[PDB]
Design a protein around this ligand. Structure first.
Ligand SMILES: C[As](C)(=O)[O-]
Ligand SMILES: C[As](C)(=O)[O-]
Ligand SMILES: C[As](C)(=O)[O-]
Ligand SMILES: C[As](C)(=O)[O-]
Ligand SMILES: [Cl-]
Ligand SMILES: [Zn+2]
Ligand SMILES: [Zn+2]
Ligand SMILES: [Zn+2]
Ligand SMILES: [Zn+2]
Lengths: 360, 360, 360, 360
């Protein structure tokens, strides 16, 4: 089979691999809808998580089951599924202690395009398929559902980590597709005033559609100073970090009240250390709690989030700026995430099969 | 000064009381908008919290400061304020351990029309005024803000106590004004499917406007059966109880999943015991957590909830069914909470003064 | 193979069952030390969880692996293990949402002697063995370790559900082996004054050894009145219920402060309803949170608790009052739990094999 | 009245100040036992929280009431009290949202020797005295109770912020008196294996007495390496930081598991930034939560912690290494904190009055 792989730091290409073996608890899946992610960009071109050799990329898919292991009970060949980017080993120590996204070791639940061949191939492998795949509800378009795999769940996790409470004033730093979902997540957790820090017109517009109330554009001056002026020197209640670099944490600390939470979901591609400013962190004692977490995954997470789409309470189609057709277009789609044109949020690639509606 | 008082069980009337003494941390307040509460109907006609002698009624007000004590620093004569129903003693033991609504003893933070003269008088007294009074934002009508004092905060507290998470399926039992605000609160905590259990059409339909997705009317059969059928026997993730009686808890237990939360905010006015069904409660072990709590109060609670109105994220005007003018009409309004017509959610009474805009 | 079974409500006896099938993730285990539980007396003689036929009893074992499935990675034939009473299906919906003891439905993680053949047989079956079996540390006696399976974990879980904080005054109601472990759990969560409500003399004496400070014996008068007198009317901070009947909940609510937690781990064997007193529960609003939960299980829970024994911080030997040798003696041991002589806390049965130290 | 003050960065001496004005909620207190703190050495000699003008030092006292305001209800002249280092304004915003130690702004609840005249004077002032002073239990020596003000509460807060669970393996970094209390705090939250990092022999032995199981001395190699050995490369579950410098955080991040908590209570006296290592922090995604908090204070905190002494479950006497008599000797005692001999944990100064037992 064919897949789009990381050949080495700074190098991608199409390669052939064997179809993966399906064990008793596994499923093999063919992609129906795919999206590329900024994270693969860091992994490939920054080498942020080490070198790789012929690792198939991608971790956002809606798919169709082509094979199930003998112990699979919830799924059958032909079923259409939402594939979460994080597919935990549910019995591992870290899962038993409440952190299934770190199953088997830090980031161990994030398999696809971390250290396991990802979803950009004709067939891919899902471990613990019953636990890790949600059936696609009939009222959700595949292109909308592929936003659940990573964008919705990560952006919402940023808001969860920021411990957002009813009526909180919140700042979301970085308004790419993950940040726009942190704006939506903060709004869904009861935030009132929401500052969205970004400068791309189309991203800023979308942030307002998801519940942002204030756009903070760095071209109008230091963003911390803008936030402080807007809040009469008091700062914000909670901060979500969904973009930027290691220096964004100092900005979050400087703009946030004491007794508060900073929720990072940004994958940090470079820099030895994240500098936390001593004085503004209350010289160690300001209760400015700092969180940085990988998204949850698995089927329950997908089902809960899908229910917001099905009930008309979450519209993920706003994230989709480019629509492609055919597996080969994932290469174009991924390059868009590297190049970042002004009109871009997320591309989606749709793939059709001759037996998509009869496969069993 | 005149106030509408409970003169004993089943008896109300206007009485004259001295203007209360204003100590260093206190303020005296005149009403601008007032609303009656079903709780005062329980108190007066059912004797649900014991007999009272000459206690002024009412605990939902927007007001205007007429006097402040010597140590008050945030308020001045003439300021317009949102008065919360619950006005804690912030340094008491219960406050120090995170339960300020029970300051000084169970329900101790609920003073007005519990054991302290309430807001239905020409002037009323607020303890710890800097802590307990929020300024009325210039963009909120007094009639809309009076819903913050008790309806919005209590309804939202039901949703907080039910521990609602992103994508949860929720049932709210009881759809009077508190129940409607529990639906709104559940929706603002990220609920997906929300079942609202009530029968009167103008309440049921307003629930849909606040985020309900399913209306359950007991006239179509047992509401537990209806909810189970709707969820294919799985039940709902979380339940808020915002009305009914002691037997509503058994319904909540029978319709909810194991590993769940039941958040009650209903004031139970009769019955020796609340029966919890042993078998459906997992014979003691189903992790169906049962919570029953008095609303939070004080200035911060009001300020946070008000910000949801100011940002256009909450409309409380839909709760108001009747609009009266003049302090005397609190008597007519309270009598409506007692006679319970089809027309009714909440009356509000507006009171005007010659120097309403010039007092200083 | 021989096992001791519930043949019907009120009837037990030895039966023959086929050696269980061992699937890819499973292990087959032979018992090395076993203990009987009060729960099995409720199940058999009270019919508290419905009728059963031919169900092997028991859910407390230290055992030795005799067979592992083809995908078992952490365990080998011959390994000595602590078997938790609760052996979850870690990928089921409930596990993914943080309640693995309810995997598959309420109480679903409690398999042994609930709806699956338990540990009182020559060989028994463990699902998801890598996830559910802890290796027996070399410095823990099998008889001390068997107290981890259910007594320590359930007792500690009562303390966890009671949300015990540093310096809290706590009451544990019911001082059988589980309650004694709730005393020990409360002490290990930082409780200061601990009241232990019991009347079997030896249980009372042992409670003082595990960190109780005040034995409350009903023969001295109403236990609620005693605790209210001892706390000059203010009540206790938190309450664990580890014994008694449905009416024990009313005692907990009457002795506890508002803004507090009642953690129940008692398996309730009869009564249609648990009555919660309306007035003392703050007429629905006292924030007296009521929790009732099945113990955690799996290997992580066992490993954590076992580390308290290995570090010299928990002595479970004080629980053992009766010692037997030979598999047949589990019948004698279970009959003690039914009859409850004054002498009794917990019996243990030791089983030996010729190749106990050589099996591989 | 005489007091020992910071006269400027690097300078201390005795000055005369006016006996403070006692408002309606205030009390004036004379010292009976006093202790110096490392924090005052950072403040005076490192200028870690800015320059100060004539600020009386000290924030650890057992005292006796000499004057109470007209609205004080729990205290009378002559009463002996435990004075917490932190004395919140309980009605401020931060207190209302659960962070009373930040009342009025970051570190605002820490008044004594932060920005308010401290306890090293003949008389000092306590705001909100009913809320902020605990009566000294008759069974606790003044020298032992003075350890509650700051050492016990801050150390225990370190363990609280580190979110320690039953059976967790914990590392406490820094074993001065606050660190010894973090060890005790961890043991009182149910930790099993506890690693105490320090090299001073007397401190190391005392750590073993408070529940440490392993002592990690840096002279035997990089402490991160030592801890990873002893945990078979998996790391510890939780880390408390109770000493060191800004570089200690990187050590904590490197020794801890993903899905974990680092609880800092150390007052960081120098360095622009705290570097968090990007890779070992899971490239922003490891769920290694970082907390840094000022101790709780007020009466309830002191009463709960004092109950641990009164019940025989905490011995603070082991912290006292030097004993002085007479108010003058607080200068000598603070100088020991600055020069730190091998001999030292905490000095205490006892102050006697002719009417100590007769004042009313
Ligand atoms: C939000 As991700 C799975 O690209 O680190
Ligand atoms: C303050 As109320 C019990 O009427 O919501
Ligand atoms: C496993 As049990 C209900 O006997 O503690
Ligand atoms: C009150 As302190 C910062 O010396 O622990
Ligand atoms: Cl002090
Ligand atoms: Zn991604
Ligand atoms: Zn009311
Ligand atoms: Zn049992
Ligand atoms: Zn100090």
């Amino acid at each position: 089979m064919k897949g789009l792989a990381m050949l080495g730091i700074g190098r991608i290409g199409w390669i052939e691999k064997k179809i993966p073996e399906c064990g008793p608890l596994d499923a093999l899946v063919r992609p129906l809808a795919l999206a590329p992610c900024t994270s693969d960009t860091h992994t490939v071109w920054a080498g942020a998580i080490g070198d790789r050799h012929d690792m198939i990329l991608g971790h956002e898919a809606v798919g169709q089951i082509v094979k199930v292991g003998s112990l699979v009970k919830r799924l059958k060949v032909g079923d259409k599924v939402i594939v979460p980017a994080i597919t935990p080993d549910w019995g591992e120590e870290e899962s038993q202690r409440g952190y299934p996204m770190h199953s088997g070791g830090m980031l161990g639940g994030w398999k696809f395009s971390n250290f396991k061949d990802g979803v950009f191939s004709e067939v891919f492998h899902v471990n613990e398929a019953d636990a890790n795949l949600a059936l696609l509800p009939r009222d959700i378009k595949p292109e909308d559902a592929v936003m659940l795999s990573d964008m919705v769940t990560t952006g919402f996790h940023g808001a969860e980590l920021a411990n957002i409470k009813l009526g909180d004033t919140v700042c979301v730093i970085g308004i790419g597709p993950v940040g726009l979902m942190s704006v939506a997540g903060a709004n869904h957790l009861g935030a009132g005033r929401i500052f969205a820090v970004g400068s791309r017109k189309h991203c800023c517009d979308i942030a307002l559609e998801y519940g942002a109330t204030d756009i903070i554009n760095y071209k109008n001056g230091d963003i911390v100073e803008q936030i402080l002026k807007a809040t009469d020197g008091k700062g914000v209640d909670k901060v979500v970090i969904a973009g930027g670099d290691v220096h964004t944490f100092a900005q979050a600390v400087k703009m946030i009240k004491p007794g508060s939470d900073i929720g990072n979901v940004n994958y940090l591609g470079e820099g030895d250390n994240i500098p936390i400013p001593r004085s503004e962190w209350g010289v160690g004692m300001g209760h400015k709690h700092i969180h940085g977490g990988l998204t949850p995954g698995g089927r329950v997470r997908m089902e809960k989030l899908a229910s917001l789409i099905s009930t008309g309470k979450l519209d993920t189609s706003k994230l989709i700026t480019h629509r492609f057709e055919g597996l080969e277009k994932v290469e174009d789609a991924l390059m868009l995430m590297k190049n970042k044109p002004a009109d871009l949020i997320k591309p989606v690639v749709r793939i059709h099969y001759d037996d998509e509606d009869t496969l069993h």
